[PDB]
C-alpha cells in the first residue's frame, strides 16, 4: 500500500489569491497522481489527472504539478465557487487505490461578533422528562469560538454538545449551536442558566442568562 | 451526458446484508471498468471496490474482502453491490465512478451517492420542540426562534419553514449523534421583534425513513 | 488459440526456489489475465505502475513472468522499494517497475506431514542484489577475517537456508506461490496483446 499525506489540512485565503496544497507519497509514483474537488453534501469532481494534466471543462486556473514523491496543486486565482475540500490520490500501486486525507480551502472575511441567544427548554419538552438548553451563535468570523455553561455559576462540562454550520454561501460567516441535557428533576433543583461566550470580536466574554 | 444514479441506501441492522444499484448513462459500458467509493460522515474519501470491463477478477478491498460483493450488468448498464454481515464502520454515502487512461486509472465521472446507516437501533421519528423568541421585543434588534428536533434515526430530516417560504436567515445544525443512538439537530432562524406579533413562524420536519411530518409553530413567548 | 502460456506457470507442478526464481517469457500470443487472481483469500494481486483494470486492453512488446516460493510474512517484500533478506539478498525489483504481483497460498501443494525441505532462500551476501539479478553461488560466506577455505564453521556460514514447510504452520509462514508479471515495451510490433 501508499500512504498519502496532504498539506495543510485546513487553510484560509481570500478571492483571488494563488492558494497551493501539497500531497507526499510514503514512495515514488512517478506522476500517477489526481486531484478531486469536493463540495459539502455534493459528490467529487475530477479536476487534475495525471499530475499535470487538466480535465475537460475544468478551468485553467487550476495547475497540477509535480514529480517523484511531493506533488502540488495550485489555483492562481482563488473564487467564490472553490470554496471545497480538495484530495489527492495516487493511482501509481493498485489496488488498493488511496485518497489523501482532505485539504478544506476557507474563504477568508472581517471578524464579526458572534449575536448570542439562549433558548430555556421548553414546558412541552420538560413534561417528556428531559430539559434541553440551547444557546445560538449567529453569523460570526472566525470559527474559534469558546462557549461555556454555567448552572449557579458553576462551568459544566461533559453535558453539552456543539453543532457548527459551515461557511455561509452569502456573507462567509459560521453558526454555532451549544445544547445542554439535563433531566427534568434535575433541571428543577437549580435556577440560574447562562451561557458564556469567548470570542475574538468581542472585547470581553458576553453572558446571556435566565431564571427557571 | 455522463449520468450515474445510484440506489439502494438505507437502515441495515448489524449482520443483515443489503444491495445497492447504479445506472449508467451517456457511454458504453462494456469498455470501461466500474469502481465503488465509500466516504464515511466525519472521515474522507475511501476506496471499496473495482470491477474490470465485462467483469471479471473482481478486486477488493481488506476488511471488505470476504464481506462484499461486487458484480455488474451490461445490458441494464447496471453496477450492483451486495454488502453481507455490515458492521457499524460500514456507515457512509457510496458513490460509483468510471475508469479511464492507457494505462493507470482515475475517476472522472461520479454519482450523486447513496446514504447506508448501519445501527442496532430502531427507526424511530423525531420530536419537535419549539425554541420561542425572546419576549423582550425591541425595536429592531433580530430575534431568534426555532425548532429542536430531537431523538430520531436514521439521517436525514429536512427542515423547512413555513412550508419552504422562508430562506432568508435560517441555519439548519447538522445532526449530531446522541450517547442513546439517536440523532438530534437544531433549527433556527433570525427575524425582525417587528415581525413577531405579525408572522405565523411554523418549521416544517419532515424525516422519511419514519415518515413523520411534523408541522411545529413557534409563537412568542406568553406571560 | 493463440493465448499466452499462463497456465503452464501458475498452474505447474513444482515451482522454483526463490532464491533461483525461475523466469518464463512471454511473446508472440494473445494474453487473457482474466484466468489469473480468482479473487480468493490470502492471495494477493497488486499491480505497480500499470492499472490491473485495463490490462486485458493494452499492447505490450515482452511479457517476463519470474515463479518462486516464499512464506505468507514475506510476500510484501516482493515489491519495488522494500527491503529484506528475500528483497536484498534474493529477489529485487526496480524502482522504476511497470508490473504486477500475484501471491497465493499453498499450504496443500509444498507442505507435507514431516516438512517439505526442498525450497531455500540465500540468507547472507557480500552485497545487495541489483533489481533482476540471480545469484545461484553456493559459496561459504564470510563473515570473520578468517578465510573459509571452502568448510564453515567460526564466523563462516551457509549462504543457503531452507525454510521448512509443514501443513501445521501459522499463516506467516505457510508456503505461498509468488508469480511477477514484468511488462516490457520496447521499440518492434508488439506481440503480446489482449482483447
Ligand atoms: C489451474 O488454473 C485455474 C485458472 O483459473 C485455477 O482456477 C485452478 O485452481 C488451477 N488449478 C487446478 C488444479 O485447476
Known sequence: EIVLTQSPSSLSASVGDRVTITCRASQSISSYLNWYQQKPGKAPKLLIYDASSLQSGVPSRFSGSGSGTDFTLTISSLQPEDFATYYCQQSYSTPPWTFGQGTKVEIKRTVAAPSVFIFPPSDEQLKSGTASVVCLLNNFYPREAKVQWKVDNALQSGNSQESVTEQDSKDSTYSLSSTLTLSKADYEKHKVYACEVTHQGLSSPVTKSFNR | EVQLVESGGGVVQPGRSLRLSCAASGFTFSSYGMHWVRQAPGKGLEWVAVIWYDGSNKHYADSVKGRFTISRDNSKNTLYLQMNSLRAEDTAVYYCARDEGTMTTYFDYWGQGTLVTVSSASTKGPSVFPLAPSSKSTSGGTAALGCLVKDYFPEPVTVSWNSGALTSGVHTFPAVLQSSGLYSLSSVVTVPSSSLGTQTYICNVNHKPSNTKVDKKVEPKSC | ???????????????????????????????????????????????????????????????????????????????????????????????????????????????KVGGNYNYLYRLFRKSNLKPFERDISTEIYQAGSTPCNGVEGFNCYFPLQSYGFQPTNGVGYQPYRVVVLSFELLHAPATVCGP
Open chain 3, 1 to 111: 488459440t493463440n493465448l499466452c502460456p499462463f497456465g503452464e506457470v501458475f498452474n505447474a507442478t513444482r515451482f522454483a526456489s526463490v532464491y533461483a526464481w525461475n523466469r518464463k517469457r512471454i511473446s508472440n500470443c494473445v494474453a487473457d489475465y482474466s484466468v489469473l487472481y480468482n479473487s480468493a483469500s490470502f492471495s494477493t494481486f497488486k499491480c505497480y505502475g500499470v492499472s490491473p483494470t485495463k490490462l486485458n486492453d493494452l499492447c505490450f512488446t515482452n511479457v517476463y513472468a519470474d515463479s518462486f516460493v516464499i512464506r505468507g510474512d514475506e510476500v510484501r517484500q516482493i515489491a519495488p522499494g522494500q527491503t529484506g533478506k528475500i528483497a536484498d539478498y534474493n529477489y529485487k525489483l526496480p524502482d522504476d517497475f511497470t508490473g504486477c504481483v500475484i501471491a497465493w497460498n499453498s499450504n496443500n501443494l509444498d507442505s
